[PDB]
Each structure stands twice: as C-alpha cells, then as structure tokens.
C-alpha cells in the first residue's frame, strides 16, 4: 500500500516487546519499507487462502494476543534480512531484494511453518506441540534459508542432498538467532516447541543423539520416511558445523573451534559457489574445504578445522 513509513510497537508470541516498521494510510499496515522491496505480513484469518489480507491495525500498537504471531513474523523477517545483508552482502533471499511476504494464522491448529516458494506461511500450532511458530527466530530463518538455497545451489529435498538442505537451514537459522543475540543456542525450535516442557527442542546441533538423531555417518538413516531422513540425517552435518564453530572431541577426533562468524562464511560460500542440486555429504566436505581454502588459505587453521570436523562425523 502507499503511505507514510511509521514505527509501531507490540509484543511477540513469547510476550517480549519490540518495535515494528509499519506503513500508515488510514490504518497502520505491517509493511516495512526500510528493507529492500519491502517486508509484508498478512492475516490468513484461520483459512488456507494465501496470502490473505495485508495486516491492518487501527492504532500502531500490537499488544493483542491475536497480533503476536504477526509481530514476530514481521520482525524476524527483518532480522533475517539484516543478517544476510550485513553479514553476507546478500539482499533478501534472492540476492535481488525480493519482497519478503509472510502469512500468519494459517489454518487451525497447524503445527508447521514453511517457505512455499514465494512466501512464508505460519501455523498457530495446537497449543501443546507448538505455539505460533513465528515465535521462533530460528524457525523463521531456517525456512527463509530454504529460499536462499533454492535461489543458489538448488539442493534437492531428499536423501543426502536433502539432509544437507535441512542442515544449511539449521545452521543459518542458528546463526541468525545468535545475530539477533537475545536467547541463542544450538537447538532448533526451542522457543515454540512444547510450551509445557522446558529444556527441549525439535533437534540439537550440539548433540543430535539427545533426540535420537545421528551424529556420525555410520549412524545415518537409510529408510524411506521423511524423504529419506532429511530432518534426521541433518544431525550429521549439524554436528560438524557445531564442531567447526565451538570445537570439541567427538568419537575421539579433536576439532579446534574457529567461531560462528567463520562457520557462517565457510558454509555461505560453499552453498553459493560450490554446491549443486545433488551434492552429497562428501561433496559438501569438499565444498567447505575449498571455501575455507579460498577465504583463509590452504595451510590455515580454518581449513584444518573443517577437515577435523568432517572426520569426526565420519564424512570423508
């Protein structure tokens, strides 16, 4: 909509106050004109028609319970935009400042959130398995990172390539959570999963086995469920990424940690320059090694730590 750029205030799903960029024309709309071609957040009104109505509010104050998922979808899309621009010089998910559109209140009791190829879609959850999923910055950034992948490597969503696709989204979801440095961790979805249970999450990058996911290639799932285990086998790559950043000794292999920023630079270069739609784990290792070589030199600690981490998870 055409209007004046304004700044509203509200509370997100977890009850935290934040400012949001809006546009004023009779109503205040969840339309942020400060980032690329815009960030636009819509009300799906418990239906499955997309995108729904551009979110309108009479007073620029977003403190109602019904507002909270919209506040977070809008704000965390902004954080994700800022991460990719400021850290990686990438303008929106396509690198060409595509508008970022999100719909909240999708369906009823819907325990999922997804990038659908052109926008984000957030369920409200059923209140037991999940609360509204836009409350999780790592979920928001995980799904928007699928769009980054689609516009770069084009990793296929099945078998080893699909597990890489999911790990890339977990890695950057987590790096965005740290960039936004409110309550970061190496867990996925902890803020919105199981409101009745403290200390759990959908999966752990630091210790995949805590939830029964593999932390070594020898433990990879080879069945047909989950598109060949894409959210299961991601644990192998997630653990490697965790080790690259934080270090540790895993199955007897010592890894010297190089920190989050270098992890992000190495994997971003691997994704955008070297991965292809069918890259397997071994090819990801090679891409990460080459990316660290490009950035830091073949004799660098960074290259050595990449190799150590992939060794530790059994990926040659």
Ligand X SMILES: O[C@@H]1[C@@H](O)[C@H](O)OC[C@H]1O
Known catalytic residues? 143, 231
- Say if residue 37 is exposed, middle or buried (CB neighbours under 10 Å; 0-12, 13-18, 19+): middle
Is 129 one of the annotated binding-site residues? no
Q: How many Cβ atoms from other residues are within 10 Å of residue 228's Cβ?
A: 19
Shortest CB 173 distance to Ca ion, Å? 7
Shortest CB 246 distance to Zn ion, Å? 8
Shortest CB 112 distance to ligand X, Å? 18
Is 302 one of the annotated binding-site residues? no
Contact present, 83 and 179 (Cβ < 8 Å) = yes
Contact present, 163 and 237 (Cβ < 8 Å) = yes
Q: Per the structure block, which two tokens stand in for 212?
A: 């029964």
> Which is nearer to ligand X, 63 or 251 (by Cβ)?
63
> Which is nearer to Zn ion, 66 or 251 (by Cβ)?
251
CA distances from 315 to 208, 217, 308 (A): 16, 6, 10
Task: Supply the DSSP string of 198-217, one letter for each residue.
Answer: TT--SEESS-GGGGT--SSG
Query: What are the residues binding Ca ion (CB under 5 A)?
Result: 57, 59, 61, 138, 177, 185, 187, 193-194, 197, 200
Residues 139-178 that bind Zn ion (CB under 5 A): 166, 169
Q: Looking at residue 197, what DSSP letter applies?
A: S
- Tokens 């508008």, residue located: 99
Is 57 one of the annotated binding-site residues? yes
Q: Per the structure block, which two tokens stand in for 10?
A: 């509200």
173 binds, among Zn ion, ligand X, Ca ion, none (CB under 5 to 8 A by kind): none
Contact present, 174 and 167 (Cβ < 8 Å) = no
307 binds, among Ca ion, Zn ion, ligand X, none (CB under 5 to 8 A by kind): none
Phi, psi (rounded to 5 degrees) for 140: -55, -50
> Which is nearer to Zn ion, 47 or 182 (by Cβ)?
182
> Which is nearer to ligand X, 53 or 254 (by Cβ)?
53
Is 43 one of the annotated binding-site residues? no
Query: What are the residues binding ligand X (CB under 6 A)?
Result: 2-3, 5, 11, 13, 15, 23, 33, 45, 47, 49, 52-53, 63-66, 68, 87, 117, 150-151, 159-160, 175, 178-179, 209, 212, 220, 222, 228-229, 233, 260-261, 264, 274, 279, 283, 286-287, 290
Shortest CB 97 distance to Zn ion, Å? 23
Contact present, 287 and 226 (Cβ < 8 Å) = no
Shortest CB 273 distance to Ca ion, Å? 27
Establish how many alpha carbons lie within 13 A of residue 200's alpha carbon, considering only the half-sphere containing its beta carbon.
Answer: 11
> Which is nearer to Zn ion, 201 or 290 (by Cβ)?
201
Residues 220-279 that bind Zn ion (CB under 5 A): 226, 231, 248, 250
2 binds, among Ca ion, ligand X, Zn ion, none (CB under 5 to 8 A by kind): ligand X
What is the 3-class SS of 130-148, one letter each residue? ECCHHHCHHHHHHHHHHHH
- Tokens 């994704």, residue located: 271
Q: Is 11 in the site for Zn ion (CB under 5 A)?
A: no
Binding-site residues for Zn(2+), in ranges, read 142, 146, 166
Residues binding Zn ion (CB under 5 A): 166, 169, 183, 185, 226, 231, 248, 250
């Amino acid at each position: 909509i055409t209007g004046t750029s304004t700044v509203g205030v509200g509370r997100g799903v977890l009850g935290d106050q934040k400012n949001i960029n809006t546009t004023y024309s009779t109503y205040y709309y969840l339309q942020d004109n400060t980032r690329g071609n815009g960030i636009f957040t819509y009300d799906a009104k418990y239906r499955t028609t997309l995108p729904g109505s551009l979110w309108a509010d009479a007073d620029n104050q977003f403190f109602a319970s019904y507002d909270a998922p919209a506040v977070d979808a809008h704000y965390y899309a902004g954080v994700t935009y800022d991460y990719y621009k400021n850290v990686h010089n990438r303008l929106s998910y396509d690198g060409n400042n595509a508008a970022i559109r999100s719909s909240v209140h999708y369906s009823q009791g819907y325990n999922n959130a997804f990038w659908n190829g052109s926008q984000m879609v957030y369920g409200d959850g059923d209140g037991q398995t999940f609360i509204p999923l836009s409350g999780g910055i790592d979920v928001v950034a995980h799904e928007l990172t699928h769009a980054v992948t689609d516009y770069t490597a084009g990793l296929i969503y099945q078998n080893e390539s699909g597990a890489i696709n999911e790990a890339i989204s977990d890695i950057f979801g987590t790096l965005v959570e740290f960039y936004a440095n409110k309550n970061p961790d190496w867990e996925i979805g902890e803020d919105v999963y199981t409101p009745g249970i403290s200390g759990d999450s959908l999966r752990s990058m630091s210790d995949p086995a805590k939830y029964g996911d593999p932390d070594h290639y020898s433990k990879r799932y080879t069945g047909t469920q989950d598109n060949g285990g894409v959210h299961i086998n991601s644990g192998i790559i997630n653990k490697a990424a965790y080790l690259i950043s934080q270090g540790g000794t895993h199955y007897g292999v010592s890894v010297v940690g190089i920190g989050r920023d270098k992890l992000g630079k190495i994997f971003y270069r691997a994704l955008t320059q070297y991965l292809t739609p069918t890259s397997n784990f071994s090819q990801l290792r090679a891409a990460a090694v080459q990316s660290a070589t490009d950035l830091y030199g073949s004799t660098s600690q960074e290259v050595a730590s990449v190799k150590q981490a992939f060794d530790a998870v059994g990926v040659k």
